[PDB]
Amino acid sequence: LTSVSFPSWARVDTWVKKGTNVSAEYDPTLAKIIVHGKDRNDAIMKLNQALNETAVYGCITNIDYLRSIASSKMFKEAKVATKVLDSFDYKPCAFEVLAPGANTSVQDYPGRTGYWRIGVPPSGPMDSYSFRLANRVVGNNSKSPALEITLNGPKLLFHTETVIAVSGGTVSCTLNDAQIAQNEPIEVKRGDILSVGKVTVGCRAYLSIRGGIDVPEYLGSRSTFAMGNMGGYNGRILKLGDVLFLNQPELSVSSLPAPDFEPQAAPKSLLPTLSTNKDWKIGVTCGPHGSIDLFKEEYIEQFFNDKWKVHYNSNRFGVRLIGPKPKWARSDGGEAGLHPSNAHDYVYSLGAINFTGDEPVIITCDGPSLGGFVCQAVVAEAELWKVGQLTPGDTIQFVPLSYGVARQLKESQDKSIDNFEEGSLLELSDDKILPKYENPILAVLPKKSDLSPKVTYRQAGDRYILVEYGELEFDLNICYRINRLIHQVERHQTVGIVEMSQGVRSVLIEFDGSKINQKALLKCLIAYESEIQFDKNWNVKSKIFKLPMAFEDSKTLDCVTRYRETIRSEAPWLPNNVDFIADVNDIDRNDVKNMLYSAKFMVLGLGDVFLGSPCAVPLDPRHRYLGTKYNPSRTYTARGVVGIGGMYMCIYNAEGSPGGYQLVGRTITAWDKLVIGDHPIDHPWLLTPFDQVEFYPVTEEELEVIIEDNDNGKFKIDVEESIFDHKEYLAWINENIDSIVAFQEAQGGEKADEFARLIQV
Amino acid sequence: VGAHLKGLPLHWQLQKCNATYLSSPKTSNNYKLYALPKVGPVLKPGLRRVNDGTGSQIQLEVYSVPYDRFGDFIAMVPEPLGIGSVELESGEWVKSFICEEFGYTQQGTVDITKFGGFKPYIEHIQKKPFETVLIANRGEIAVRIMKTLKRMGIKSVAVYSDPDKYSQHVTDADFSVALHGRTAAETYLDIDKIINAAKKTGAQAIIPGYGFLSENADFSDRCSQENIVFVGPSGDAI
Amino acid sequence: MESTLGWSVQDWLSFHSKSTPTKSLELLENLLKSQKPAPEDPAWISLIPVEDLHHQWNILQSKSNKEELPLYGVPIAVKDNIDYKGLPTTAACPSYLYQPTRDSYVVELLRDAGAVVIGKTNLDQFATGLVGTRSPYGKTPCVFNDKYVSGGSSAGSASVVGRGIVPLSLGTDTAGSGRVPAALNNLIGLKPTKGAFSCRGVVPACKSLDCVSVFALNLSDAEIAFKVMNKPDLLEDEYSREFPKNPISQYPKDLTIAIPKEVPWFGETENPKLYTKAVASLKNTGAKIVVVDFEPLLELARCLYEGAWVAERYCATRDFLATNPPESSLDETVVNIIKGAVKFDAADAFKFEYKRQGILQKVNLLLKDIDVLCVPTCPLNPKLEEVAQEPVLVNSRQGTWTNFVNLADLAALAVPSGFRSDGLPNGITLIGKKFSDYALLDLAKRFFSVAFPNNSRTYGKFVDRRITVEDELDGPSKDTLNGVKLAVVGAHLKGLPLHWQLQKCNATYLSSPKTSNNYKLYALPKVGPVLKPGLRRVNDGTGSQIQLEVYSVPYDRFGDFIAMVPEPLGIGSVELESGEWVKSFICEEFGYTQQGTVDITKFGGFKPYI
Amino acid sequence: KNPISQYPKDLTIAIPKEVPWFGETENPKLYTKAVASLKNTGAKIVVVDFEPLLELARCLYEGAWVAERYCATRDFLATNPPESSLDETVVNIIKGAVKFDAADAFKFEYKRQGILQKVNLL
């Protein structure tokens, strides 16, 4: 059960709440809902309200069935008999999944916004334009949820009447076996079977229903995030047998937004132009890292000159690309990892083209947030829909685009959806395209003092400016500074700023171009930057987490095995990741297992990677080991796995997430989806920047006990509220300055460089 | 007149506002005292002044409440009550609790004037069947049986299968005993396990709910032949 | 473009709303350009660079609820006494100059509220004097006639406001420095309750007595500035103290205003006429005017002058004086005063503190039955050359009515009373007890409407403009309440004959909602010469919505209010239309169950029926 | 008016985080026992940092309050009365006041007010 609400004024005898696992073993009673009225009629009305007010989700229930009975003319007139219910006409205002399709999910738009700094992706439709067309064609409010069909669709039985439309890729669509048109409002009867087949052109299509689909919100949105078992129809793609409810105003008690518009065939000039031949031009804004401090000149040229092929390992987390190999400006990435694409983890832009080692991937709507590699360019907001229609084998070319042109396209899609009038859709055309890639570096502030470092402002998408502190280097003070920058925008309350996302030495700033333009935001930022005042003696509230971890358990090791037999079977960090850490740092593997159980990990940012996954750094500089992130990254990692990426530590809070850190052991997830855990945290992400994580040793089997206990809120997380005092820490550094320096001077050498050379292949 | 009397459970509210005890006089014979429908765990009287013949003298305690604090005091005074005035035996008028008409006109109001005061009556009101009781059940009935047990100050004992080790009724109970296994037959239905569970926890009685061993007469008889009281009918009747 | 001289705060905000971020930046740039520093305009010690104006304005744009910022883009001047981080701080002493790295808390608050600082403003050196002549940066003239003194020590700030460069400015006041220059320049001078405005980031000069102060052209703007800066700062200013809840907002029409038995004028003949007339005008507001011997207050004033309080100024400056800075940097009159502190040991400081406490006993006995003092702001309008001739005696006399206020923990508002024959202004200061600042403002409002009938009130040098709307007040914001929400239905309603009882207990009107559908209303048998309703909660079903007025009644005062409530009424709770429960008048059943009771529910309220 | 006459059975009683005894071994036992007794009345005991209060205390000693005695006694002392009438420890404490300006006295009054801000919040 995922959400459980009962009328508090009735008596309800139950044994369930948010969190409860309901099994099929004994008897499927959930609750007994008991009402007390002045007389039969008063009681029948009370019982209906109570039933209306009962929200239980996570299991199929008989609530709708109850509601219909409690509501019947039969029950009220008291024409009740032991026989009645056996011939009772029950019709769900709903459809039913006769077949699921390859990957069919409830989605909405703009999706799960508000939480990128945490690493909660928006989800929602992969091609947002078609999605919104589909909604509009049927006259839905734009917040209505719809189905995303991928590669091939479901066949659905409708138990009630409504209007339907399909938009997106080319798919043959059936209503009771007669072909049906895309982009038109189709009237569906009851007993009707709608079926949408294989997508011939593009990847995805969208099936809208007048009034939208009735599914509970999670974190503001009805969008499905499958990886996180979050949202949509009970956290997953549809299955044979599922039953989804609609919003018929007369037969419904629903909080879904009523339709705004009469249904209407989409004007054809407003339809998007899908490629015709598995080949695409895709507009991007240059940046953040398409600059020669990181990539060689000619590789930047090749990036935009050559075509990229879509790799079979592509999905909503991101679309992987095959093409030219990168020539790097640096020999390695220093402390953030040896491979030259490795970067002090910073928060990515939706649409960013992320170089996970020597291969790139487009970050899409189910995609990672706080990440450890450089990004070359970012698909323009309004161009992302193309990426949602790519299929393996497609070819693409990235086409440079100015901030302004990127806004033009976007605004044209909004005007197209809002008015729904021929001719208002703008699309890529040669006079819209920059002659040559431009410089992503918008401005550089020089270093002024020890606590006020150089600032580098990089263009990072249609929607963001990346602010980078310092040289490519970690320094705790910069983390407090980022906190102060954020504070200066709040003090200042800036109009137009959507969300600021903390990374290790950076912060990503998302804006609304309709409220503030790129140039304006740049200047306010340059300016607030000089208002930041603080001294080396700062302090912060800091929660200290003590978390059980199994060293190199079976599921951690199996994650590497899967990576060896599926992606790269050997590399300098293979076959065993811990042996790599040990070898490149010249220590014993058990020295690595000692540090993990002694080091104090300060959380620097969240969503590395997904659902509040932390990026942390040992507070002891002698606990910072050389390393590297995978090249290329894994596609799969187990829930609770602990990683080490260069000197940084992460906990993969989600099951089945791509990952690039060196795998070392396993904890419990620091994401409590239903906030049922036994801790004092009020939202799902348990950690906050400046918190501290310490590990203590448990056995694999002792950890599986803890894991089950914690999923049911019967495990008592060891958390203490305290205060991190930078002046106390500076103090501590001195009382160990000599140890620290001796450790630091002796860290790299020729051996680490051979590794950096091999790692780069 | 009510819960603010010395020894009753809202008296503290007078000490909070730095009140000072003055005296214990009675109203004139012009009042009637009603015990309002109990809702909270605090029972509350309401005074009613009458144009006669029928009022009596009710006992009161009179306090000096600083001018400075009276605000703090009335904020703690909920519907249907209020502060008005009352006439003492002596003829002096004095601030006092009064009560809306609506108040003493609810179902469940009892006319309490006979007792002359509110203390008398809370004494004319003021018996544990078992000390610890085991529930031979799971789910919703277990939870409901435990609410009553709790309210009765009776210690409760859960029993659970392995899929139920995390269920409400296990949480709610004072004590619990893992039966080991998954199926109905493996656990809840296994008389030997159940009776051992009640032994192990020193439960004087077992209450079965419905389903499972509820209408099982061997079980009712096992309880009897074991000196554990089956809360249900005899094995014979069953 | 467009003239900006003599704009109210509201004038400025209106411009900003209907203008663009760029044309409003230009207006301030243009204002900044017209100002001159140094000796050319003695009023300004220093002015911001154009870059700083940009910085402040970028800072400002940065804010996302502009149009909720009560001083959005409003320019202000601040006494060079008070830190603003964009400019140096000087205390009118060239070699004392220093650069603060941080704003006054007070400045910081005004900026948070949207204001832009334009410059630091000239003052008697180290804020020592009431004349404004004691600055090596120049003698600031009276805004009306350059032969005359501007008044001090907040001289720049008065000048600047008086000619409408800027609608608000900051000063400081120990013993008159925020009151005297208001009188001499036709301004409002607000001297708030001690510790209300933080003194964090102002250079100490009589720390234990000192207040930040405000100049304005009108009551409205003085009020907005007060609301902005009246903020605690306990851990950073040892004399900061939090305003209490439920501040009074109006004196009764009835209030007792004390005036002095003996009013020395020291030869001056014009100013007495303004004072006499001003007293006449207060009488006409309905105030009770009482003539009172101000002996104890003058003993208190003398204690200031005789005592060791000068050692406070010396304490704040001796390290610096021992630096032996260039003589030309110093005002000699100021420095000689400050060095008078050397002849007092610790034992002396105590002896005088003892005497001060003794006088205050007498002063507190005197003020117990008085609401307000009405005092001439100052006896003279000194000529520049007159204070050159007698550089100490003029000063002493200008402090006749100002020196005892802070020692007595009082608040004060200097307010115009009109013009003398020779076209110079003067006025009165109204002195109230601790935390009366809001009521003083309102009392000024009421004074103004009689003294300046038919909207005939001038401001600053603007002798031919009229106050229309700009002297009106919001009163204290709901922020400040802490009381019982009380619904009245009967004789306590606005306009009926027990409303006064709410005013006596310092109630505040909140709203006028109706009950839910559950109530009847009765008229009870009249016995007094007042007729009285009783509310009845009902549920057969047959109730109406009865009309109510709802008031916030301070918690410490509710005792006083309920004590006035006789049988058969009482205070219980009632249900409003919206479902909220709220304290209210109720009625014993016996009350509306008498012969003579009339069912009044029909009228929906008690007004309709009476 | 209305002076309180009773603390609640609940009252919050503060004791110091640091209790210096300067070598004394017997008296700590009584203090411990006494705190136990207070707990047992139903009072809530909270351990609290008394620094600012001891900071206030030292001001009486280091500060210029000693000048109050000198103020109260100097006219007499200047008579130079017979040494044997005077106790030397006292008179020397009192003559220590000479080392304070008016200015000094204020400087210390300021610090006192600053501590009291902290103490009244505490």
Residue numbers in the entry:
A (entry chain B): 977 to 1737
B (entry chain B): 489 to 614, 621 to 732
C (entry chain A): 1 to 610
D (entry chain B): 245 to 366
Would you copy out the relevant sentences from the publication that reported this structure?
The first step of their urea utilization is the conversion of urea to ammonium, which is catalyzed by two distinct enzymes, urease and urea amidolyase (UA). UA is composed of urea carboxylase (UC) and allophanate hydrolase (AH) domains. UC converts urea to allophanate, and AH subsequently converts it to ammonium. Biotin is covalently linked to its biotin-carboxyl carrier protein (BCCP) domain. Its biotin carboxylase (BC) and carboxyltransferase (CT) domains catalyze sequential reactions in urea caboxylation.
